[PDB]
Amino acid sequence: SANNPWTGFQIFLSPYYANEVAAAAKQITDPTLSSKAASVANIPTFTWLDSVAKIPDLGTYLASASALGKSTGTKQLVQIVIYDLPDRDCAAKAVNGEFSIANNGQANYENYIDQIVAQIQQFPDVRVVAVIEPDSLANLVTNLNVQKCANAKTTYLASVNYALTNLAKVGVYMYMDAGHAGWLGWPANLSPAAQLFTQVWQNAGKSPFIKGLATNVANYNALQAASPDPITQGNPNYDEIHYINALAPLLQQAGWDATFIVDQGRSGVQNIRQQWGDWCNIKGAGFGTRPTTNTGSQFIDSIVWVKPGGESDGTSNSSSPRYDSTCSLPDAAQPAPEAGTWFQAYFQTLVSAANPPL
Numbered sequence: 001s002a003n004n005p006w007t008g009f010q011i012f013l014s015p016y017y018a019n020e021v022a023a024a025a026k027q028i029t030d031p032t033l034s035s036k037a038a039s040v041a042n043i044p045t046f047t048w049l050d051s052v053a054k055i056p057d058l059g060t061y062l063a064s065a066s067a068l069g070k071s072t073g074t075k076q077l078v079q080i081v082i083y084d085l086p087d088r089d090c091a092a093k094a095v096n097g098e099f100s101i102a103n104n105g106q107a108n109y110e111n112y113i114d115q116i117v118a119q120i121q122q123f124p125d126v127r128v129v130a131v132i133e134p135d136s137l138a139n140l141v142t143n144l145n146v147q148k149c150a151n152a153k154t155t156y157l158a159s160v161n162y163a164l165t166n167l168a169k170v171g172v173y174m175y176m177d178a179g180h181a182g183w184l185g186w187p188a189n190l191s192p193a194a195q196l197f198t199q200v201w202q203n204a205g206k207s208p209f210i211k212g213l214a215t216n217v218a219n220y221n222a223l224q225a226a227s228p229d230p231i232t233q234g235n236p237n238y239d240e241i242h243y244i245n246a247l248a249p250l251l252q253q254a255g256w257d258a259t260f261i262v263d264q265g266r267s268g269v270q271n272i273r274q275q276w277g278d279w280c281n282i283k284g285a286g287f288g289t290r291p292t293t294n295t296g297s298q299f300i301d302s303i304v305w306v307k308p309g310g311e312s313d314g315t316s317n318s319s320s321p322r323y324d325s326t327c328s329l330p331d332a333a334q335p336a337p338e339a340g341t342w343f344q345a346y347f348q349t350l351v352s353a354a355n356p357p358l
Helices: 015-027 031-042 052-072 105-120 137-142 147-168 187-203 240-253 344-352
Strands: 047-049 076-082 127-132 173-177 210-215 259-263 300-304
Touching (some): 015 031, 015 052, 015 344, 047 052, 052 076, 052 105, 127 147, 137 147, 137 173, 137 187, 147 173, 187 240, 210 240, 210 300, 240 259
Parallel strands (some): 047 076, 076 127, 127 173, 173 210, 210 259, 259 300
16 A cells, blocks of 8 residues: 555564563573574564553553654654453463453453553654454454354454544554464455454444554464465465455455555464464474565565564463463473463574574
8 A cells, every 4th residue: 555554664672572582592502593582672573462551561662662763863663462352362262361241341441442542642753553453353254153252242343343443543553453364364264254354444434544454463374385384285375475365355345455464473484383273382483574564465564573472372281270272282382381471492492493594
């Protein structure tokens, strides 16, 4: 499209990820690996607003970005993930997330959005790009047979709508999460997916700030695969570019000339999964293509690092109340700590296996 949110801006680098990476490079013993590892703090990632407790961090990042822009003669851009739906991750094996539908989820999520909007409103010289609710809408395409998802459907739709509608009022550029090629890219899932995303776009008033969709968030697919990963058998859309090429024209026909962003933060190593649906701490993953607007596709505004590689996807300890058995599969790195916390051994391999190399 004409207006790529990233062009003409400097991305604000997460100080939280930078601090994690610096501490990790010190725990890495080999000096050559260590310098490459240390350089990861300079690679832009998304900040996950996975709880209300993270909202004050957003405020500090906006204010820091505003001051940095003035100090360096740049316009700054802060990258966030909206990730706090009630009954979050409905098809997962474990309950996570602070809000529940049965305890005023909708009002509490709305208040979470209101607190985010109230921060963003105070810093109009900082641009914000938000990924909207990974692992939400995609479940409403393929997983309505999952009872938790069926029962969450109206709440997910209403809550995502509230986020889109109100973040648009403060000019946030938004990409709704849209799964990945092995979820919604199956040809038979494309039309149902397009129908859902276009209904969501319509309900939020077709705001031009709703730029499109984010794919491969927290996943491992290639953007452009050299050859199909064996996990993809049966699906001609074996990588993200095939998925996006197939989905984009369906959205265009609805009057939404959508554009896309694609997570590649853990895509450096292909052919590492037994089954395509295995998502948790996949062993042998490497850092992938670094964020860039040089995407190779008319539909793709940016390659991004949404999931911050090195932070766990979930614990492998079956005694944890947060335990999802996907995190104990043969292709999951074990033992693994709680979701969101630092997983040092996993980070070190991401560095060693990076492709292109660091």
